[PDB]
């Protein structure tokens, strides 16, 4: 009980995200080995506002950061 407060989010096999692996373990949840198991979070959002505030990323930029992030788990 008692973990470091870094935000290195991890996807629990139960469909809930934990702030880092140490919290993942305190809860007794297993890693999901699939970020899809946590759709609609932030690192993996299924929604987004429709505000236009474009971001680089590559060719298929993104209307906003949420739209860019709608591509799971990435760095």
């Amino acid at each position: 009980a008692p973990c470091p407060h870094t935000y290195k989010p991890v996807c629990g096999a139960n469909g809930e995200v934990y702030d880092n692996e140490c919290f993942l373990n305190k809860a007794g949840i297993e890693p999901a080995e699939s970020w899809e198991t946590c759709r609609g979070h932030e690192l993996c959002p299924s929604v987004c506002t429709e505000e236009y505030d474009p971001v680089c990323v590559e060719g298929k930029i993104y209307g906003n950061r949420c739209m860019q992030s709608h591509f799971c788990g990435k760095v």
Partner: protein, 274 residues
């Protein structure tokens, strides 16, 4: 010390307001990141929160507050002025501080909105895929008398490609694109055949969290114009069905060109409420 944003006069909501119809008694629900209730130029009268840890009367993003301002900013000695400044304003928090959410959280808000009797539903949001629980949430809301509006998306256009998002692509939901002050299409605005109408979505100025104001872009700003343009038709002709308020807004629109880009065109609140 109160300016009228260029959106109000451009859709002619000022003409209708001048007749005394400002949307009183009409209950409009903003499904967004919440609203800054304590904002001087906003009267949030109800709502519910579907994000853990945060209430419905706070906005940690800004978006929600800036969407609701475009709808029902208090007609007073200060701030800005909304399309339907007399509306009963409800804050349904379905998004997080980052402007993101799950299909489940949105379905929840829709359902809450149907149960508590919202006259208008605004959704400045949209994923690329739909979900049957959300197509069901809206279909069961539209059929029950609730007018459902949503941003068409900011995916632009290339070729015949349909770039409309959900829940804007549903036939039971009014897909609203975005234009600028000159009535020209915002080059970021989603194209498609589900596209129904256009509205101010370029340099839109409205309320913003912690008692201030901001100028935003996107079809998210376009939506609360149509959402508010509905709250007006219902203060002047408060006996129309959801389908009548809707048919009126689209029929009496100003054609701006191809409906694959402009839909019906820029809504005319004055004409739709004649």
């Amino acid at each position: 010390a109160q300016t009228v944003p260029y959106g109000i006069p451009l859709i002619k909501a000022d003409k209708v307001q001048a007749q005394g119809f400002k949307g009183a008694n009409v209950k409009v629900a903003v499904l967004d990141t919440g609203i800054q209730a304590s904002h001087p130029d906003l009267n949030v009268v109800g709502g519910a929160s579907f994000v853990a840890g945060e209430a419905y009367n706070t906005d940690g993003n800004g978006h929600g507050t800036h969407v609701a301002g475009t709808v029902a900013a208090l007609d007073n000695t200060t701030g800005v002025l909304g399309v339907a400044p007399s509306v009963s304003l409800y804050a349904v928090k379905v998004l997080n501080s980052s402007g993101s959410g799950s299909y489940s959280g949105i379905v929840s808000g829709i359902e809450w909105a149907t149960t508590n009797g919202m006259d208008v539903i605004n959704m400045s949001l949209g994923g690329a895929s739909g979900s049957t629980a959300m197509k069901q949430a809206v279909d069961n809301a539209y059929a029950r008398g609730v007018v459902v509006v949503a941003a068409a998306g900011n995916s632009g256009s290339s070729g015949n490609t349909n770039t409309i998002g959900y829940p804007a692509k549903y036939d039971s939901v009014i897909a609203v694109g975005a234009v600028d002050s000159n009535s020209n299409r915002a080059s970021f605005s989603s194209v498609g055949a589900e596209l129904e109408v256009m509205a101010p979505g370029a340099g839109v100025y409205s309320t913003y969290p912690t008692n201030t104001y901001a100028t935003l872009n996107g079809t998210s700003m376009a939506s609360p114009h149509v959402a508010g343009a509905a709250a007006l038709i219902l203060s002047k002709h408060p006996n129309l069905s959801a389908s009548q308020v809707r048919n009126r807004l689209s029929s009496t629109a100003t054609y701006l060109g191809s409906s694959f880009y402009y839909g019906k065109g820029l809504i005319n609140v004055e004409a739709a409420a004649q």
